[PDB]
Design an enzyme around this catalytic site. Structure first.
Site, short mmCIF file in Angstrom:
data_model
loop_
_atom_site.label_atom_id
_atom_site.label_comp_id
_atom_site.label_asym_id
_atom_site.label_seq_id
_atom_site.Cartn_x
_atom_site.Cartn_y
_atom_site.Cartn_z
N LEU A 18 102.96 -16.79 160.01
CA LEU A 18 101.88 -17.46 159.33
C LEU A 18 102.21 -18.62 158.42
O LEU A 18 101.42 -19.48 158.17
CB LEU A 18 100.88 -16.54 158.71
N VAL A 22 108.42 -16.10 152.72
CA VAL A 22 108.01 -15.87 154.06
C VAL A 22 106.76 -15.05 154.25
O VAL A 22 106.77 -13.77 153.75
CB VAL A 22 109.10 -15.40 154.92
N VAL A 23 105.77 -15.37 154.92
CA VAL A 23 104.61 -14.88 155.27
C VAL A 23 104.34 -14.59 156.80
O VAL A 23 104.44 -15.46 157.51
CB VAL A 23 103.23 -15.45 154.72
N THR A 76 99.80 -6.21 152.24
CA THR A 76 98.41 -6.36 151.69
C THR A 76 97.67 -6.35 152.82
O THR A 76 98.08 -6.61 154.09
CB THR A 76 97.85 -7.42 151.06
N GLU A 77 96.35 -6.01 152.80
CA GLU A 77 95.01 -6.47 153.92
C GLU A 77 95.32 -7.75 154.36
O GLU A 77 95.68 -8.60 153.91
CB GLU A 77 93.84 -6.22 153.25
N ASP A 123 94.65 -19.64 138.15
CA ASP A 123 94.72 -20.92 139.32
C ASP A 123 93.46 -20.61 140.32
O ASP A 123 93.78 -20.75 141.52
CB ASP A 123 96.04 -20.67 139.92
N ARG A 127 91.92 -22.92 147.62
CA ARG A 127 93.32 -22.66 148.13
C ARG A 127 93.57 -21.31 147.88
O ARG A 127 94.59 -20.90 148.71
CB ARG A 127 94.07 -23.84 147.90
N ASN A 128 93.16 -20.56 146.87
CA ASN A 128 93.83 -19.45 146.46
C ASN A 128 92.92 -18.15 146.89
O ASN A 128 92.87 -17.39 145.83
CB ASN A 128 94.07 -19.53 144.89
N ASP A 141 96.29 -14.30 144.99
CA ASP A 141 97.21 -15.16 144.38
C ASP A 141 97.03 -14.98 142.82
O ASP A 141 97.35 -15.77 142.02
CB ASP A 141 97.41 -16.63 144.55
N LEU A 144 100.30 -14.23 141.13
CA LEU A 144 101.35 -15.13 140.80
C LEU A 144 100.94 -15.91 139.43
O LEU A 144 100.03 -15.78 138.79
CB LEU A 144 101.65 -16.05 141.75
#
Ligand SMILES: Cc1ccccc1-n1ncc(C(=O)c2cccc(C3CCN(S(C)(=O)=O)CC3)c2)c1N
Length: 245
Positions: A18, A22-23, A76-77, A123, A127-128, A141, A144
């Site tokens: 994705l 790395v995801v 995670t989900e 944040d 985007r998050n 996120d 983080l």
């Protein structure tokens, strides 16, 4: 150990990549869709540690961790519709105008939970956030420099508080109602900083009604103490939802 949070890596079936630590997308015990984040080692696992203590239906949910193997996984989900920003830009054929405010409510419920835990996101932005197969928006996120989502006291003195999360939420609402435009779209970060301090605010997006705009606008009060809480904002959002639908 991480107790019941420890996942057996051999229960994972990696399916698709994705992004790139790395995801990847996969399944846990052939049953559940998950997202898997691969990997410093000590600060990578912090995200998961924060996520072990925070649980809410509008917050991206930790399933577990794989720490007895290199590289280390966070599981995670899975959020099928990906990033809210891309969703707002690329997936408009899939949601109605009334649903824009529902997206706001989803995020607001997540933020009200965080606030009650005296936990700052720092944040908050489209985007998050992530979106599942049902179009439910969830904050991500949080385990983080975003100048465009920051109040002046952050820009000028690094004064972070609940009220800085409140400001950014207002900017997130603006992102949602503008269908994913970049805030202050014709300005640089530096110009944005200058204009914010002078009391310039984001304009009312065309899709936003006057009531909705009042809600996002209230998040941008120059005085941090004059900004509402997420509790207040949630009640404002439900009210408008009842009126505008
Ligand atoms: C693994 C992990 C640990 C802790 C917090 C969040 C995640 N996480 N990362 C991705 C996803 C997703 O569910 C997801 C599913 C499908 C798509 C996407 C996109 C999002 C945006 N990313 S990116 C950062 O490369 O732009 C691409 C992939 C994300 C998800 N839940």
């Amino acid at each position: 150990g991480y107790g019941s949070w420890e996942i057996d890596p051999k229960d994972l079936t990696f399916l698709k990549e994705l992004g790139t630590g790395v995801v990847k997308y996969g399944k846990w015990r052939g049953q559940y869709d998950v997202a898997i984040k691969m990997i410093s080692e000590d600060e990578f696992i912090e995200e998961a540690k924060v996520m072990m203590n925070l649980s809410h239906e509008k917050l991206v949910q930790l399933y577990g961790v794989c720490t007895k193997q290199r590289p280390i996984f966070i599981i995670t989900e899975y959020m099928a519709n990906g990033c809210l920003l891309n969703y707002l830009r690329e997936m408009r054929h899939r949601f109605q105008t009334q649903q824009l405010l529902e997206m706001c409510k989803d995020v607001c419920e997540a933020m009200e939970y965080l606030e009650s835990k005296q936990f700052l996101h720092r944040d908050l932005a489209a985007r998050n956030c992530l979106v599942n197969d049902q179009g439910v928006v969830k904050v991500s996120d949080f385990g983080l420099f975003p100048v465009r989502w920051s109040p002046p006291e952050v820009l000028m003195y690094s004064k972070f508080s609940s009220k800085s999360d409140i400001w950014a939420f207002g900017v997130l609402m603006w992102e949602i109602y503008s269908l994913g435009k970049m805030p202050y779209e014709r300005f640089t970060n530096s110009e944005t900083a200058e204009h914010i301090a002078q009391g310039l605010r984001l304009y009312r997006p065309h899709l936003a009604s006057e009531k909705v705009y009042t809600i996002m606008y209230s998040c941008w009060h120059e005085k941090a103490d004059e900004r509402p809480t997420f509790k207040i904002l949630l009640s404002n959002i439900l009210d408008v939802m009842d009126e505008e639908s």
